[PDB]
Structures are given as C-alpha cells and as structure tokens.
Design a protein around this ligand. Structure first.
Ligand SMILES: [Mn+2]
Ligand SMILES: [Mn+2]
Length: 504
C-alpha cells in the first residue's frame, strides 16, 4: 500500500464561541474531539478577503473549494473588479476604451445596462459609477443608463435609494441619464421566458412601454399598484431615451452570467429567435464577463485559468488521486477543486455517491455519509492512492434547514464516519488534514430562536494528524494545499502562493 494523504472537508462546519444554536458544539463528536486533542490544530479564515470575497462576505462551497484546490487566494469577480477600480487598471481597460472609441468616432451613443443595487451577487452599482467617470474622462457626450431593479439580493423595496444616489451622480459628473427602468423579473429572466424579456427590450429600445417623467415616478407608481422592485414593469423615461441605433455601444456591467445571457442574446446573438428582432447594426457590445458562447461580445474581464492546482501538481509528480463525495458536493471536490476544470488529471479517479432524493436534508441527516465512508474504505484497501480529497456534505446541507436537532444528528453521523476513515488512514501510516470550506452548522438559530439558514463568516478548524509538529496560528484556505504538498514531500511551485500550515 502507498501511504495516503487525505484532505477531509466537513462542509459548512466552523468555530464559533456561542453555543446557542451551535450544532458543532452541541453534537457528540468523540472522534473529532479525540483527533483534535491528540494532534496539532489551528483555525483558518474561509470568508471575505482571505478567500477572494468582499470584506464581511460569508464563504461558500464553490469559492471555498476553488481556494482550497488552488493553494492561493482566488479572486472572485466582484473583488477583482473592485480592485481594478481601486488601483486604476479599470480606467485603462482595453475593451471599455474601445467601446468608447466606437462611440466617439461615430458620434453615436453609449448605453449602460445592469442591476442597479449593491446586492453583489450579479452586479454592483458602484461599477456603474466608475463607467460614468471613465466616459466623462474620455469625453463621451451621450450616456444612457438602463436600470434593472433588484429587490431580491437586497431589501424588496429599496430601488428609490439607488436611483436617487445615481441621479445625484449624473448631476455631479454632468453626464448620463436614465433612459429606461425595468424589474429584474423582465430584464434578468433565466428560464427562456422570452415574453418577459421582450418587455424590457421594448423599453430599452424606445419601442413600446409606459413612460414616466422620472425613474422615481415610475417606481412609486409601481409601488402604488403593489408591485415591488423585482416586478416593476419596464418603462421609458420621457425625453431621456432616443433608442438604440446603428453605431451605438452597450456596456453590461453584470458579472454573473446566468441572468445576463438572455438579454445579451437578444441584442448580440445573430441567430436569436426567441422573438422577431431587427438587430442593431455596427453595435459594439461589451459584457463585464463572458455570459455564454452564443453572444458576439467584447469581454471586459476575461476568465483566468488557474495553473498548478493541487490535482495538477499531483499529476506532475506521478501521484494518484481520488476525489470523493455525495452528489451535493461532488462538483466541489471535482470541477471546483481542479480550478474550474471538468477533465480528470492523469492518475485521477473519482467516486460519486448518490445523495438521497428529499426536498430538505433534515429528513435524513446522515444523508449518504455512510455510503461515502464505505466507498472510501474500499478505495483505501486497494493501496494505490497517494492523495484523497473527500467532502462530507452533511453539516452544510442539513444546516441550511435551520433546524437544530437534525443538524446535530448530521454532525454525529459524520463523526462516526470520520473515525473509521481517519483510523484507516493512520493504520496505513498516512496523514489526514481535517477541516472545512466555510461555516454554517455552527449557527442554525438566530439569537431569538428563529431558524437561521445561511453560511457564517466564522473561521474553520484544522487538524493535521502528524505528531511532533506545530501549526501556524492562523491562515486561510489557500494554505491547505501547500500543507498537503508538505505532507507528501512534493515541491511547491511558485504560482501556488499560499503557505504550509506546518512550521519549519
Ligand atoms: Mn461548503
Ligand atoms: Mn451551502
């Protein structure tokens, strides 16, 4: 048998001082406790800037497993764009400046499309303000803003505030105006409901829609009819919309593809047939990210491939590896772990265990953890594995139910499985790193005893089952893969910028 090293991710399992609604602390976890008391231990950050998110933003599974596999901080779109604005590269961006040069050279118009909120899931409105400043700096004359209203990633009736602050911006810079206003239900549909999109399109293009003298006025009218932000029926702002015409440019500042793709196909997929259109000629169509492959767009922030993730380094040292998890975390231990790559590395094998088919996992807190554990045992008994990446989904997936007793039971089943897994590894003269990708199950009740159903910003435990070493006192997810390479005695390449948790 080879000596195995395994990373064991207890999804959504973190350190929190309060015991109130804390399923991690209330659960009986004798194996975890035994390993924790015997072996070297620390705590590392899995939220915010430490994993490429905004300060204060709770971690998640996708961002977590990306950072873990990469062994470095993997900047997500919002932070990437924020930082680009802060250090100036944004204002030098080739694609944004070409879009502007198209407008300036045709004396045509610049249109800006996006979700006008600080939700941060699909867009951030401060990126609109940076586009306004760029256009102003480059002397563009006509800027039309097409506002898509949120109400879903922020309070359900908050649009007036973003609109007001945006109006003050147009006045402060002497450029820009709202030309159309649409609920995200219409402009940001993702279920091929082309009829809803056509209403937004018609307002954007000055074709057919209600008109109001101001963005505020249309929104208040909507509110008066009982229709909140998300559902505002698209409208045109009187005298502030001259259509989308040949030679214009569009910049769409949303960075999340799923809900920006459809509207972008309407304008810039020559094959679009959701409804009949006469597409604009000589249109320069820029998207902040690439929404899909059927849109002829210039892409402002291109995807970066990640070289030398843990799986690639393993391959390149002629090691063999296993990725294993039940369904709900299978993409995390595969695609996201490998840096957003579906293809297996040479020497990679995978094990998918079917999750149960229930609407919510409080109905079976053990989920398929026991079958995951049994698969791993069968794999370890083959003796041919160098590296194992395992995820127990339960604490996250049960914790999302906001129910304390089932989340405790989820943890307890995971603890029983952890015991058999980790003892086998130790039986085989191997090493485990036991940790998590962000918190959740550490808090499943608000302070007033209501269900709490979300991840947390709490730091995560690390146990490394190697005797006579000391761990560094803090760190981040991007340090786990360097710790694995340390355990395996494999050289760490320069593009993995994290650092081994084991002191030397
Ligand atoms: Mn997770
Ligand atoms: Mn989750």
């Amino acid at each position: 048998a080879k000596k195995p090293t395994a990373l064991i991710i207890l999804d959504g399992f973190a350190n929190r001082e309060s015991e109130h609604g804390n399923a991690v602390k209330l659960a009986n976890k004798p194996n975890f406790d035994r390993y924790y008391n015997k072996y070297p231990t620390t705590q590392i950050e899995a939220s915010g800037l430490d994993v490429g998110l905004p300060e204060g933003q709770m971690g998640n599974s996708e961002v977590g497993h990306m950072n873990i596999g990469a062994g470095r901080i993997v900047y997500q779109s919002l932070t990437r764009i924020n930082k680009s604005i802060e250090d100036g590269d944004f204002f030098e961006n080739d694609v944004l400046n070409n879009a502007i040069a198209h407008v300036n050279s045709h004396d045509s118009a610049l249109h800006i499309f996006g979700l006008l909120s600080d939700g941060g899931v699909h867009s951030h409105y401060k990126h609109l303000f940076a586009l306004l400043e760029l256009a102003k700096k480059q002397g563009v004359e006509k800027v039309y803003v097409h506002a898509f209203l949120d109400g879903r990633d922020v309070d359900q009736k908050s649009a007036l505030k973003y609109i007001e602050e945006t109006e003050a911006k147009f006045n402060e810079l002497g450029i820009g105006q709202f030309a159309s206003v649409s609920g995200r239900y219409y402009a940001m549909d993702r279920d091929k409901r082309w009829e809803r999109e056509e209403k937004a399109y018609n307002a954007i293009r000055n074709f057919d829609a209600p008109t109001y003298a101001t963005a505020k006025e249309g929104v208040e009218a909507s509110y008066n009819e009982g229709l909140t932000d998300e559902f505002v029926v698209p409208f045109i702002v009187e005298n502030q919309n001259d259509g989308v015409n040949d030679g214009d440019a569009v910049i769409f500042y949303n960075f999340r593809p799923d809900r920006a793709a459809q509207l972008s196909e309407i304008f810039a997929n020559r094959a679009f047939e959701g409804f009949k259109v006469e597409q604009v000629k000589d249109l320069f169509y820029a998207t902040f990210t690439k929404y899909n492959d059927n849109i002829d767009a210039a892409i402002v922030f291109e995807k970066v491939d990640l070289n030398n993730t843990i799986g690639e380094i393993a391959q390149n040292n002629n090691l063999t590896q296993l990725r294993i998890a039940e369904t709900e975390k299978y993409p995390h231990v595969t695609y996201f772990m490998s840096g957003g790559r579906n293809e297996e590395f040479k020497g990679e094998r995978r094990r998918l265990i079917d999750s149960p088919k229930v609407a919510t996992y409080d109905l079976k807190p053990e989920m398929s953890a026991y079958e995951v554990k049994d698969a791993l045992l069968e794999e370890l008994n083959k003796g041919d594995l160098d590296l194992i990446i395992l995820n127990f989904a339960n604490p996250d997936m049960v914790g999302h139910s906001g129910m304390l007793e089932p989340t405790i039971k989820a943890i307890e089943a995971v603890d029983e499985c952890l015991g058999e897994v980790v003892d086998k590894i130790l039986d085989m003269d191997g090493y485990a790193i036991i940790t998590a990708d962000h918190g959740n199950s550490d808090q499943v009740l608000t302070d007033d005893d209501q269900p709490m159903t979300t991840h947390t910003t709490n730091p995560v435990p690390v146990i490394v089952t190697k005797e006579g070493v000391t761990l560094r006192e803090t760190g981040r997810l991007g340090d786990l893969a360097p710790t694995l390479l340390d355990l395996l005695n494999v050289e760490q390449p320069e593009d993995m910028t994290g650092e081994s948790l084991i002191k030397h």
